[PDB]
C-alpha cells in the first residue's frame, strides 16, 4: 500500500539524526558525518519488505482500538531496526562473498578507503539499533523482550552464516555436505530468522503478546514459509528471466542439494567437477545438468505441495494469532 | 591480582561456553556449535584477562562486604568475562583486517548478550548492564572508524594528527571500553545508579586511559617489535612531534611516517630523537601522574579512592 510505504520511508531520516546528529558525540563530527552516509548508503534504498512487514504484522496482531498514529510509527520504528541488522549482515556478507553489487550499486566494501573496514561498518549499523530502541522503547514493557529478540536472531544468523561456511573448503564446495537436513538448518537460522521470525515476533511483542507458546505456534509456520521462500529464490537464481552466481560461488543451493540426491554416478561427477568453477561454461554445464534431472518440473511439485501442506498447518494454528497475518505472507511469497 | 581471584574467574569459562554451545539442549546444527565452542577456547580465555579481573577487582572494592558471598564475586567474573567476549571481537577484528571467519567478530560480540541474558535478566542492574555494552560498543565503533579517517590509501594524514583528534581515538576506540566498562559494571552489580558516580569514575578513568596509550605509544618507539611509524598510527610521538616541528622537521614527516622501509622508520626515530620527546615524555609522565593522583585523593559521591589508587599504580608502575 502507498501509505504504509511512504508513512514507513517517513521515519528514515528521523533515525538518522538520532545515531549521528542528536548532539552526542560533537567532540568528533567527521565519523558521525561518515556513520550519516554509511546509513544512507546501506539501509534505504531495498524494497524494506521485512520493515514493512513488522508494520502490517502489528496492525493485524494488535487490537483494532489500540491501533494509533503514534503506535503504528513505534512499528515503523521496530522494522527500520529489522532493516538497521539487514544493512549490517548484508555488508559484512558481500565482503565474506566478495560481490560486485548488491540493490544494483556497488557493495559498500568495493567503495574507496573502506575494504575490510566495512567489518567495522558492519558492527556499527548492528550496533545503532539498540541506541534507537533506547530512544523510542526503552519506558515500554516490550523494551527487554525486543532488545533480548535481536540480540539473539544476531546470533542465530551467525550461526547460519557459518554452516553456509562448513559446506566450502578453501573456495570449493563439500558436495558431501550439500543434504536436505543441512540446506533446511542453513536458510532457518541464516534467513527465516531475521526474515520472518523477527519481524512478526516483534509486531507481536509491540502488541504485548508475550505468550511463548503463541510465538512457537507463529515460528513452525513463519519457518515452513521461510523453506519456500529461499527455495523459490533458489530456483530463480538459475531458472529466473535476467544475473545469477549460485553455480559460480558454488552454494548450498536447493537445486544443487536436489540435483545431488537425483543424480546417477556420472552425473554426480558433472557437479564434483564444475559446481563452484569461475569459467562461465562451467556454469551452462550445471544450468544444462539440472534441465536433464527435470529440476524445473520438480520445483513446479514442490511449489504446489508446499502451498498446500502451509495453508492446512495455518488452518490447525491454535486460537489467538490471526491466521489472515499467515496468509497474507503466503500470498506475498507464493504471489497466490 | 591474587592466586584464588585468578583461579575462581578462570574456573567460569567453560560455564561460558557451554552455555554459548546449548550443550546438554541437543541442538540441530551440532557441527557449528562445535566450531564456535573451538572459536571461544582458541581465542577468548588465553593470556592476562587484565579487563575481566579488573571488573571483579572493582565490584570487591564498591559493594559492601556483607555483600561479597561466592555467589555475587561468581556474578562480578561472568560480567568480566562479557568484557573478555568484547575484547576477543576486537582482537579478531583487528586480526581480520591484518582458521577465523569474517562473522566471528560480531557472533563473539553477540555472545555477551546471551550471557548476560542467562545470568543478569532478574536483577535490576541488568538494564543499565546491557545499556552500557550497547553505548560502549557504538562509542568503540566510532572510535575505530576516527582512526580509519587518519589514513587515506595506504598514507597517512598528517593535517588529521591533533592532540584533540588523537585524545578522541584513544577515549572513543580504547579508555570506554577497556577503563569505564570494567568499573561502570562493578558499580551497577554494586547497585550504584547515580549518574554522578559514573561521571566522577568516568572522568578518572578516562584520563588514566589516555597515559596508559600515551605510554604504550612512547615504548613502540623506544621500548626494549614496535611497527606504529612503518604502519603511519596516529600515535602520542606522531602528534607531538608535528607540533614540535619546524617546517624542515615537518617534511621528513610528510617523507618517511608510514613507509615500509627499515631505514624510514630510522630516520622517524632519529626525528623524535632530535625534538626530544623522550624528555617530554617523562615531563607529561610526571605532571599527568600527580593531576591524576590529585583528582583520585578528590574523588567525592561516596566513591572509594583505592579502587582508582589501585587503577593508576597499575598503569604507572
Ligand atoms: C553473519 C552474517 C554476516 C550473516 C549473513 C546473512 C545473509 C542474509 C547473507 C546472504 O546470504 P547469501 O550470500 O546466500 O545471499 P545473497 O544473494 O543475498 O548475498
Ligand atoms: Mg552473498
Ligand atoms: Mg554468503
Ligand atoms: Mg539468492
Ligand atoms: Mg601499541
Same mark, same amino acid.
Given at each position: 500500500s502507498?501509505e504504509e510505504?511512504?508513512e514507513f520511508?517517513?521515519?528514515?531520516?528521523?533515525?538518522?539524526?538520532?545515531?549521528?546528529?542528536?548532539?552526542?558525540?560533537? !567532540? =568528533?563530527?567527521?565519523?558521525?558525518?561518515?556513520?550519516?552516509?554509511?546509513?544512507?548508503?546501506?539501509?534505504?534504498?531495498?524494497?524494506?519488505?521485512?520493515?514493512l512487514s513488522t508494520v502490517i504484522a502489528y496492525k493485524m496482531l494488535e487490537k483494532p482500538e489500540n491501533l494509533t498514529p503514534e503506535n503504528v510509527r513505534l512499528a515503523g520504528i521496530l522494522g527500520?531496526?529489522?532493516?538497521?541488522?539487514?544493512?549490517?549482515?548484508?555488508?559484512?556478507?558481500?565482503?565474506?562473498?566478495?560481490?560486485?553489487?548488491?540493490?544494483?550499486?556497488?557493495?559498500?566494501?568495493?567503495?574507496?578507503?573502506?575494504?575490510?573496514?566495512? =567489518?567495522?561498518?558492519?558492527?556499527?549499523?548492528?550496533?545503532?539499533?539498540?541506541?534507537?530502541?533506547?530512544?523510542y522503547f526503552?519506558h515500554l514493557p516490550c523494551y527487554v523482550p525486543i532488545?533480548?529478540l535481536?540480540?539473539?536472531?544476531?546470533?542465530?544468523?551467525?550461526?547460519?552464516?557459518?554452516? !553456509?561456511?562448513?559446506?566450502?573448503?578453501?573456495?570449493?564446495?563439500?558436495?558431501?555436505?550439500?543434504?536436505?537436513?543441512?540446506?533446511?538448518?542453513?536458510?532457518?537460522?541464516?534467513?527465516?530468522?531475521?526474515?520472518?521470525?523477527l519481524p512478526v515476533s516483534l509486531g507481536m511483542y509491540l502488541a504485548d503478546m508475550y505468550d511463548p507458546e503463541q510465538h512457537r505456534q507463529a515460528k513452525?509456520i513463519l519457518?515452513?514459509?521461510?523453506?519456500?521462500?529461499?527455495?523459490?529464490? !533458489?530456483?530463480?537464481?538459475?531458472?529466473?528471466?535476467?544475473?545469477?552466481?549460485?553455480?559460480?560461488?558454488?552454494?548450498?543451493?536447493?537445486?544443487?542439494?536436489?540435483?545431488?540426491?537425483?543424480?546417477?554416478?556420472?552425473?554426480?561427477?558433472?557437479?564434483?567437477?564444475?559446481?563452484?568453477?569461475?569459467?562461465?561454461?562451467?556454469?551452462? =554445464?550445471?544450468?544444462?545438468?539440472?534441465?536433464?534431472?527435470?529440476?524445473?518440473?520438480?520445483?513446479?511439485?514442490?511449489?504446489?505441495?508446499?502451498?498446500?501442506?502451509?495453508?492446512?498447518?495455518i488452518?490447525?494454528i491454535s486460537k489467538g494469532l490471526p491466521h489472515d497475518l499467515f496468509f497474507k505472507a503466503?500470498?506475498?511469497?507464493?504471489?497466490?
Amino acid at each position: 500500500s502507498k501509505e504504509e510505504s511512504r508513512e514507513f520511508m517517513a521515519i528514515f531520516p528521523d533515525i538518522v539524526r538520532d545515531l549521528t546528529d542528536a548532539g552526542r558525540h560533537t !567532540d =568528533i563530527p567527521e565519523v558521525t558525518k561518515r556513520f550519516a552516509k554509511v546509513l544512507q548508503y546501506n539501509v534505504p534504498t531495498g524494497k524494506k519488505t521485512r520493515g514493512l512487514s513488522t508494520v502490517i504484522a502489528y496492525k493485524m496482531l494488535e487490537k483494532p482500538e489500540n491501533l494509533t498514529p503514534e503506535n503504528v510509527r513505534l512499528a515503523g520504528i521496530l522494522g527500520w531496526c529489522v532493516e538497521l541488522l539487514q544493512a549490517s549482515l548484508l555488508i559484512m556478507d558481500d565482503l565474506m562473498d566478495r560481490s560486485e553489487t548488491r540493490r544494483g550499486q556497488p557493495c559498500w566494501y568495493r567503495q574507496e578507503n573502506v575494504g575490510f573496514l566495512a =567489518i567495522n561498518d558492519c558492527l556499527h549499523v548492528e550496533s545503532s539499533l539498540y541506541s534507537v530502541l533506547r530512544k523510542y522503547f526503552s519506558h515500554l514493557p516490550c523494551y527487554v523482550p525486543i532488545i533480548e529478540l535481536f540480540h539473539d536472531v544476531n546470533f542465530k544468523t551467525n550461526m547460519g552464516q557459518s554452516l !553456509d561456511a562448513l559446506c566450502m573448503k578453501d573456495g570449493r564446495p563439500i558436495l558431501s555436505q550439500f543434504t536436505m537436513k543441512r540446506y533446511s538448518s542453513i536458510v532457518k537460522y541464516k534467513t527465516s530468522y531475521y526474515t520472518f521470525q523477527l519481524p512478526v515476533s516483534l509486531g507481536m511483542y509491540l502488541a504485548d503478546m508475550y505468550d511463548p507458546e503463541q510465538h512457537r505456534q507463529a515460528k513452525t509456520i513463519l519457518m515452513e514459509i521461510g523453506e519456500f521462500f529461499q527455495i523459490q529464490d !533458489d530456483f530463480l537464481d538459475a531458472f529466473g528471466d535476467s544475473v545469477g552466481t549460485d553455480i559460480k560461488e558454488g552454494k548450498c543451493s536447493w537445486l544443487a542439494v536436489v540435483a545431488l540426491q537425483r543424480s546417477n554416478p556420472a552425473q554426480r561427477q558433472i557437479m564434483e567437477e564444475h559446481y563452484g568453477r569461475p569459467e562461465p561454461e562451467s556454469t551452462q =554445464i550445471i544450468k544444462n545438468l539440472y534441465i536433464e534431472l527435470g529440476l524445473p518440473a520438480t520445483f513446479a511439485v514442490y511449489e504446489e505441495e508446499s502451498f498446500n501442506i502451509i495453508r492446512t498447518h495455518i488452518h490447525q494454528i491454535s486460537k489467538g494469532l490471526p491466521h489472515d497475518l499467515f496468509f497474507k505472507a503466503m500470498k506475498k511469497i507464493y504471489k497466490r
